[PDB]
Design a binder for this molecule. Sequence first.
Ligand SMILES: [Zn+2]
Lengths: 286, 94, 50, 48, 287, 50, 272, 70, 53
Amino acid sequence: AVQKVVVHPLVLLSVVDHFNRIGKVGNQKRVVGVLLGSWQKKVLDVSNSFAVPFDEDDKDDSVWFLDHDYLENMYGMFKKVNARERIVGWYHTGPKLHKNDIAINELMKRYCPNSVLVIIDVKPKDLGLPTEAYISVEEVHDDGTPTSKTFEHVTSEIGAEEAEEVGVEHLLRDIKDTTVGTLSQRITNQVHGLKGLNSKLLDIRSYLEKVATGKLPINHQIIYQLQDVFNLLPDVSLQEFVKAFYLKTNDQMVVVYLASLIRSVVALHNLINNKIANRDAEKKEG
Amino acid sequence: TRPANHRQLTFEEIAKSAKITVNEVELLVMKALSVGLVKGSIDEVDKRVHMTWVQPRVLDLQQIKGMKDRLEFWCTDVKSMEMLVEHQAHDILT
Amino acid sequence: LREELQLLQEQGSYVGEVVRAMDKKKVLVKVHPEGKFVVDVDKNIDINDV
Amino acid sequence: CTKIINADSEDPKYIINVKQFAKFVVDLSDQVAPTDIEEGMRVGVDRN
Amino acid sequence: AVDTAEQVYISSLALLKMLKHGRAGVPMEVMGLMLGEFVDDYTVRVIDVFAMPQSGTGVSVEAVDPVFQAKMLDMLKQTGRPEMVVGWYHSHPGFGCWLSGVDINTQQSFEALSERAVAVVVDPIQSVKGKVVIDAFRLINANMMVLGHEPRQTTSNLGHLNKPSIQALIHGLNRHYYSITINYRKNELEQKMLLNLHKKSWMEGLTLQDYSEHCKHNESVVKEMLELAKNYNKAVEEEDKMTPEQLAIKNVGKQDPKRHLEEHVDVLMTSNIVQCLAAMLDTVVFK
Amino acid sequence: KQYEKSENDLKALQSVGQIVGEVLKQLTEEKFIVKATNGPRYVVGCRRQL
Amino acid sequence: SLGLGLAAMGTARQDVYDLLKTNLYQDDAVTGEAAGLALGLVMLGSKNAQAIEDMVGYAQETQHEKILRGLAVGIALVMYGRMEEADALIESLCRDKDPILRRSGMYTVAMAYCGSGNNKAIRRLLHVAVSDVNDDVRRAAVESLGFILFRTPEQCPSVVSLLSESYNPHVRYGAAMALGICCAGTGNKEAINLLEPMTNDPVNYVRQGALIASALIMIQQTEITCPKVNQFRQLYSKVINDKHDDVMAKFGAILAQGILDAGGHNVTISLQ
Amino acid sequence: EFLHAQEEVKRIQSIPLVIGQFLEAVDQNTAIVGSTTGSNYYVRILSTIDRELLKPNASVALHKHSNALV
Amino acid sequence: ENSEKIKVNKTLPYLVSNVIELLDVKCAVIKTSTRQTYFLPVIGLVDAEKLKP
Ligand SMILES: [Zn+2]
């Protein structure tokens, strides 16, 4: 059971270039490569990657090629230049995963047993998702379902490292916004923080429309049982939470009589100091 | 049946629907708190039973339909009142 | 402030006691933990100021 | 210049001290005769 | 046909492979190869960087493995892109950048093979704050040794990107090689996906950082601001004609006037507004 | 068995050392004052979870 | 080609236009400056269908940048004083992320709006003069001020009064040339008051452009006409007989000697 | 730009710094400091430290390269 | 090929030293003739049973 993966920011980048290498002839719309990593704890780390020649045909949709020979020797070279690094899994792109991914994963679990795949989104780069990591489990099934492979979820993030954030800050130099700017910046944090509140809402909007309609089979295990836990929270009981709002008056009180008065009086000093310096330099000009 | 709208249930509703006597509704709810399918509390001067409930189970498809309507009211409150904030604070946004 | 930040990002100087001066803008200085040295002067300092 | 402690057979394996710096184990160069590298002898030693 | 003011293009991944391989072997002067393309007469670009295994000799021509050369190139032809080598690099940790003795010997082999084969020297441990100490250099001949080296001509982009630094011009630099200009091939489809994905937090914008940690902070700052107001009273009621611009410079204390003023009041303003706006929006949204 | 010892040696080629010192006092929660066994004093920190 | 485009400047002749196209599609790196400049000169003030379209279509897929900088001035020079008809092209070139092509649009908005006090021009050109990130396009913003305001030279010292006092030298450089090209040959003494700290800058090349702009303003002006003539002739003579300045620092000085006595004191510069 | 000037100044003091001792004060913001490495130096100091903590002596922090008082 | 690589990685300039103690969590403390104390996670091209303080 893997806790989470850590995206070193060289690997994604090194997927973008190889998608751009074949992209002049790119019509396969997918690039499989090998995900090198550093196994630390239950938490996982990723440091490097490389590619592999890959083909696949939708006709019979099981005809494909992972070059074992290319995977042995080139990883052997990265072992020689760096003994710290080993394989932890693989990756592909083209955000809709395809039916073959059971076959690639169950093949190269004989290189690392708890292997893990990461889907990146090279063209989608817009709203809320950097990557995603999948994992395989095989229990009986459930209480009552037929057995299968069933790609499961591992939560993901983007990590960093000292002496690579230097390459982050120096290569961008573009907008260079700090978190400070507490009037302008924090309000916009509340703005687009809420623009994802309806974005996750419109996603949970669309899911129960197409399962109440009843197209896809209802996941009786987690897909609403975790929502059954969720939908009781929102407590808004009034007549004691109405009495939260003299603390609102208390938070107001420091703003009103302290910050409006002193800011006005200090700028009033700048009037008399200027009106003296105006005319006493004017009457001494002649 | 009432999803936390006014979840402070009165004792007579339990004593009628469970058809248990009035004096044993307290020993009945202390057992359900002892098992752990509910995490409420008990008043006795008013004999109203306050409810906080964390135990999940199946919901027959019909309760998704009511869950859709509550999610749609949830939609236009988030959507329209964000348009209020953005149009008000547009010039300090950048 | 930027002019203040650039001048502080600069290697520090050494302190050394002058024994006595040579001729033509040269002196005789042991630093602190080394041998003695015959070095050159800058523009603003003079032999007679030593 | 340094001083030599000893040598080993079939190879240089020269053990050399400074008495102020550290003690190195180094190789002979090309311009030497390997006979006159007797022990306790002051010898000219490269910097690199 | 002779040199001008050139330009060096480096890819975004190339610089990241430099600093990572330098940070890995920080004591022992790591070594690697540089793979790019010669696009014209006098602008060079590089797309790719792969390193070298550590040799016991050090940074020299003996650290180049020819069987690790050709077989690594054998793989990159059939996968990704085949292209010609255009140079090399190493790391020099003890100083910023200048070609040393064994540096310049292996350069002569490369310029005998290639046209230019530009060297690259990077200190990994000096680059800390927000800038990188990277510079690329290129050896000169002995035919113009009593003449002016770097034969540069009709351009005006030579005075930038560095003046020759004195820790670098005390060695070779001038009458031995020349310095060259380096900018970055900054691209889209990489820039925003590095920016938005590295610094991001969704639900942080409407958290509360509570009240029990926050009313205590509002409690504290007002108390010394009261004494700051008492110190603000003291200078205002003073108001003497002791040449008050000279009276202020003989009363410097890194203190009151206007600097130790409303700066605190601005922090008291911004903290409570972001606290109360987050409080009012959360009552609005949720039921 | 011989190839096992060779691959252990290829693993055994990155012991860039560690510096032995002693903690003099605690400055803050993540700042300390240490000193080398023959060298100067420093202000340091820990790794992550020490 | 530079000689052919200059002698046949403004002809809109088809035969010189045709062989300049097949010169452009040679795809050599070093004649790209040669093809692009002459292709604009034969199509100066034309607003042709194929001229703008082929040049703006060619200026993205190429691999060099001398090919781009020749076509940068060339598509700026194919339109001249249209004053409203370039606005779709002005919006198109600046919205692109090519830094040379954004710079090329800044020379295009200069040449389409010559001598007119357009409020929309001075709003938009100053807007990208603030917010843009590349230094070269920021210069061509603040260099284009004299091209749109030389008819009324009085506003130019007032608007470049604080443009000469930015933090980067690139804005201060194009500020100095803007004094040189707005006011052509006036004995202003207000711009000369501005140029005196400009030639006393820490950075070398902004002093260089200050020396050239001081040379541009005071050709054929005696000491009785304005009292700053012989002050700067010996200032030019000081820095040219100085030893410890840059070649960059003295390139403007020897050029200022060439400007100040040009034509044997018989000709002048006057865009008006 | 005034905030980025504040940021790059106020992260000069979060470095694994070396420890020295204050020895003498020359003038405004320039002093002699002796290090625990010996070999007495002469550096410029910051613009932040209140100067009432350096009267004959102080345990002080020093930069690695520029060796300034921090 | 591995033994050839170890052959070219045993340079010449062997800095002699002194081993003071040995630990496990394989671990050893090294004092050089520069009188500097070092610590290792990995010993190297020897055997720990062949060594001693
Ligand atoms: Zn070197």
